[PDB]
Structures are given as C-alpha cells and as structure tokens.
C-alpha cells in the first residue's frame, strides 16, 4: 500500500463515494426523457439517411458534395 503522491491526488475520485447511491428513483425519471429524445434523433437521422424523410433542399446523395 504505497502512499504515492499521485495516489493522494486521485484517491478522492477513486473511492471517496464508493458504494453510495440515493434511495428511490432519483434522477431516473429525467433520464427517461433524454432516452426518448435521442430515440427520436437517431430515428430521424436513419430515415434521412434512408430517404424516407426528405428534408427540403437536402439531397441525401453524392450530389450534396457540391461546394468543395
């Protein structure tokens, strides 16, 4: 159990609050919303990549490279 200097610096981040949790649900409800949000985001991207969704003036193909 060497008491190095860097260990002194980092031990608080390592295991100061090890094994601690808040009871109940806590922030879990909020997390739910975030997941749903990204579940739309990714979905939209997929369809945009899939050409299911066609955004206005956004030609999902090699033609969009025009301008470089």
């Amino acid at each position: 159990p060497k008491q190095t200097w860097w260990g002194d610096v980092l031990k608080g981040n390592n295991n100061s609050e090890a094994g601690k949790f808040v009871p109940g649900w806590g922030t879990t409800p909020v997390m739910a919303g975030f997941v749903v949000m990204i579940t739309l985001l990714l979905l939209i991207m997929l369809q945009v990549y899939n050409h299911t969704i066609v955004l206005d003036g956004v030609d999902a193909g090699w033609t969009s490279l025009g301008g470089f």
Binding site: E17, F21, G26, V48, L55, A60, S64
Partner: protein, 63 residues
C-alpha cells in the same frame, strides 16, 4: 459548422464538424453530471453498478 437541417445530410462534411462540436458539448455536460450525481438505488441495484462486469456488458454492446 452550420446548424441548419442540411447538416444532417450524411454526404455533406459540414455535418461532421457540427456533430463533433455539439455532441462534444453534450458529452461535457454529460461528464459533469456524472462526475457529481450519484446513481439511484433502483437503477444501482438493477444494473449492479458495483460490479464491473456490467460495464463490460454495456461497453461491448456499444462497440
């Protein structure tokens, strides 16, 4: 970078920058929260956050 919707065109490189900026910030916030916030008993017991094997499982799925 441009935040107009045509940055979601996968073939236009202006999206990539626009991604790595915004997503980058999103991770920083996401970092800060997790550097401070504790888990929840419910999730902590469900996912067994005390056991590194759960981190392995989730990381392998992500990869």
């Amino acid at each position: 970078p441009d935040w107009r919707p045509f940055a979601f065109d996968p073939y236009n490189p202006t999206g990539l920058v626009t991604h790595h900026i915004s997503a980058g910030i999103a991770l920083i916030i996401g970092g800060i929260f997790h550097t401070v916030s504790r888990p929840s008993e419910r999730l902590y017991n469900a996912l067994s956050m005390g056991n590194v094997e759960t981190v392995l499982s989730s990381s392998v799925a992500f990869v």
